[PDB]
Enzyme design. Structure first.
Site, PDB file in Angstrom:
ATOM      1  N   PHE A 190       0.889  -1.207   0.000  1.00  9.90           N
ATOM      2  CA  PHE A 190       0.000   0.000   0.000  1.00  9.90           C
ATOM      3  C   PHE A 190       0.900   1.222   0.000  1.00  9.90           C
ATOM      4  CE2 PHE A 190      -2.870  -3.132   1.983  1.00  9.90           C
ATOM      5  CZ  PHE A 190      -3.947  -3.021   1.078  1.00  9.90           C
ATOM      6  N   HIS A 203       0.399   7.371   2.629  1.00 13.48           N
ATOM      7  CA  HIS A 203      -0.854   8.092   2.985  1.00 13.48           C
ATOM      8  C   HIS A 203      -0.766   8.602   4.397  1.00 13.48           C
ATOM      9  CE1 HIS A 203      -1.208   4.006   4.675  1.00 13.48           C
ATOM     10  NE2 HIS A 203      -2.089   4.518   5.543  1.00 13.48           N
ATOM     11  N   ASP A 247      -3.496   8.622   7.685  1.00 16.85           N
ATOM     12  CA  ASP A 247      -4.775   7.941   8.028  1.00 16.85           C
ATOM     13  C   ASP A 247      -5.966   8.884   8.163  1.00 16.85           C
ATOM     14  OD1 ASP A 247      -3.593   5.434   8.172  1.00 16.85           O
ATOM     15  OD2 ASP A 247      -3.361   5.490  10.316  1.00 16.85           O
ATOM     16  N   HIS A 281       2.859   7.355   6.032  1.00 22.42           N
ATOM     17  CA  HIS A 281       3.433   6.034   6.163  1.00 22.42           C
ATOM     18  C   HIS A 281       2.979   5.187   5.007  1.00 22.42           C
ATOM     19  CE1 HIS A 281      -0.473   6.148   8.265  1.00 22.42           C
ATOM     20  NE2 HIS A 281      -0.545   4.808   8.047  1.00 22.42           N
TER      21      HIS A 281
HETATM   22  N1  KKA Z   1     -12.694   0.708   5.568  1.00 20.57           N
HETATM   23  C1  KKA Z   1     -12.385   1.507   6.783  1.00 20.57           C
HETATM   24  C2  KKA Z   1     -11.290   2.541   6.519  1.00 20.57           C
HETATM   25  C3  KKA Z   1     -10.055   1.900   5.897  1.00 20.57           C
HETATM   26  C4  KKA Z   1      -9.092   3.014   5.520  1.00 20.57           C
HETATM   27  C5  KKA Z   1      -7.910   2.433   4.828  1.00 20.57           C
HETATM   28  O1  KKA Z   1      -8.026   1.683   3.859  1.00 20.57           O
HETATM   29  N2  KKA Z   1      -6.720   2.713   5.368  1.00 20.57           N
HETATM   30  C6  KKA Z   1      -5.510   2.116   4.786  1.00 20.57           C
HETATM   31  C7  KKA Z   1      -5.060   2.895   3.523  1.00 20.57           C
HETATM   32  C8  KKA Z   1      -3.904   2.169   2.773  1.00 20.57           C
HETATM   33  S1  KKA Z   1      -3.875   2.684   1.041  1.00 20.57           S
HETATM   34  C9  KKA Z   1      -4.396   2.155   5.817  1.00 20.57           C
HETATM   35  O2  KKA Z   1      -4.393   2.949   6.813  1.00 20.57           O
HETATM   36  O3  KKA Z   1      -3.443   1.280   5.525  1.00 20.57           O
HETATM   37  C10 KKA Z   1     -13.519   2.423   7.308  1.00 20.57           C
HETATM   38  O4  KKA Z   1     -14.578   2.459   6.520  1.00 20.57           O
HETATM   39  O5  KKA Z   1     -13.398   3.002   8.356  1.00 20.57           O
HETATM   40 FE    FE Z   2      -2.439   3.812   7.539  1.00 24.22          FE
END
Ligand code: KKA
Ligand code: FE
Length: 329
Positions: A209, A212, A214, A268
């Site tokens: 991944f 980004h 959070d 991160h």
């Molecule tokens: N589906 C969750 C949020 C998920 C958010 C998410 O994908 N974060 C990844 C981004 C990696 S590109 C991470 O921090 O590694 C919700 O609806 O709360």
């Molecule tokens: Fe993250």
């Protein structure tokens, strides 16, 4: 090669008790880690993480392709138009290796006023059949409340660290309405590992991944004991060491907004590792209408030139943005 990030281990057990001076000494450590790399390990947190990992492994290893379609979010199954956040996120073999299951507040039931109103970001959780996954739903809902309790205590420590009273964030983090999510992520071992499922960073690092920040107030993560995360610092990307007894904590971009980037949301990314492992984040979100007025702990009058932003507006915009930036997970 890559240097090791400074990620201190902080004993957070005073945040559960009533020794106020001891809580202040934990808050100083949270302040120092938040001003440095933006990550720390919370230790002596009270949660049984080994059992968490065993129950999550039993789920991931027994769920079948049939059940995955039946639980899938709308990105994978057009029949499930009300599942934007909660449900199963399928792998695509040969292409996208990771798979996950997300669930939200167990109090978002069909009778909940925000579910009745169809308010964005609120959904009723979907669960596999009890006879196929005995005890899983009850275990996962109890886990939500165990990590909610840890997160409340950590929010007391962040409040004290910022010079505020201990309920400054926690008063907006409530069982009846929190938008917080648990995600149970499986990273597989594959041989051969498809190249399509491996991203490449500008510096050549192989990634699962990309970089980004959070979408959260804070993120409270349990991971297997396999090194994989990196944090961008002034000296470049640095490796965060593994510790599958502690919880890895960092701020999300709502904290950065509230604090005028005094506590940054650290950038991160997740290195590609060909290993069967788990990643179980809890994204600490407030209520849909929660607004905290922004401030600046570096300014003598504490004023900031940032506009108040409701948590619901922040979250709906952030989840969409993150999908557009780094793709559907
Ligand atoms: N589906 C969750 C949020 C998920 C958010 C998410 O994908 N974060 C990844 C981004 C990696 S590109 C991470 O921090 O590694 C919700 O609806 O709360
Ligand atoms: Fe993250």
């Amino acid at each position: 090669s890559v240097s090791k990030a400074n990620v201190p281990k902080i004993d957070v057990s005073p945040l559960f008790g009533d020794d106020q001076a001891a809580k202040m000494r934990v808050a100083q450590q949270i302040d120092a880690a938040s001003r440095d790399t933006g990550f720390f390990y919370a230790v002596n947190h009270g949660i049984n993480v080994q059992r968490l990992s065993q129950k999550t492994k039993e789920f991931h290893m027994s769920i079948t392709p049939e059940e995955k379609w039946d639980l899938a979010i709308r990105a994978y199954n057009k029949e499930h138009q009300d599942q934007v956040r909660a449900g199963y996120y399928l792998s695509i073999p040969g292409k996208k290796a990771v798979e996950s299951f997300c669930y939200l507040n167990p109090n978002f039931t069909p009778d909940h006023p925000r579910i009745q109103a169809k308010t964005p970001t609120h959904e009723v959780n979907v669960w596999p059949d009890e006879t196929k996954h005995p005890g899983f739903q009850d275990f996962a809902e109890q886990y939500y409340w165990d990590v909610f309790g840890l997160s409340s205590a950590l929010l007391k420590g962040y409040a004290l660290a910022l010079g505020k009273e201990e309920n400054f964030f926690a008063r907006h983090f409530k069982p009846d309405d929190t938008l917080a999510s648990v995600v149970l992520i499986r990273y597989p071992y594959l041989d051969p590992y498809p190249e399509a499922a491996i991203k490449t960073a500008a510096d050549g690092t192989k990634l699962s991944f990309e970089w980004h920040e959070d979408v959260s107030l804070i993120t409270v993560l349990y991971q297997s004991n396999v090194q994989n995360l990196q944090v961008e610092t002034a000296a470049g990307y640095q490796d965060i060491e593994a510790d599958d007894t502690g919880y890895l904590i960092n701020c999300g971009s709502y904290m950065a907004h509230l604090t005028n980037n005094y506590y940054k949301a650290p950038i991160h990314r997740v290195k590609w590792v060909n290993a069967e492992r788990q990643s179980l984040p809890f994204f600490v979100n407030l209520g849909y209408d929660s607004v905290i007025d922004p401030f600046d702990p570096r300014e003598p009058n504490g004023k900031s030139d940032r506009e108040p932003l409701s948590y619901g507006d922040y979250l709906q915009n952030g989840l969409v943005s993150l999908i557009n930036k780094n793709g559907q997970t």
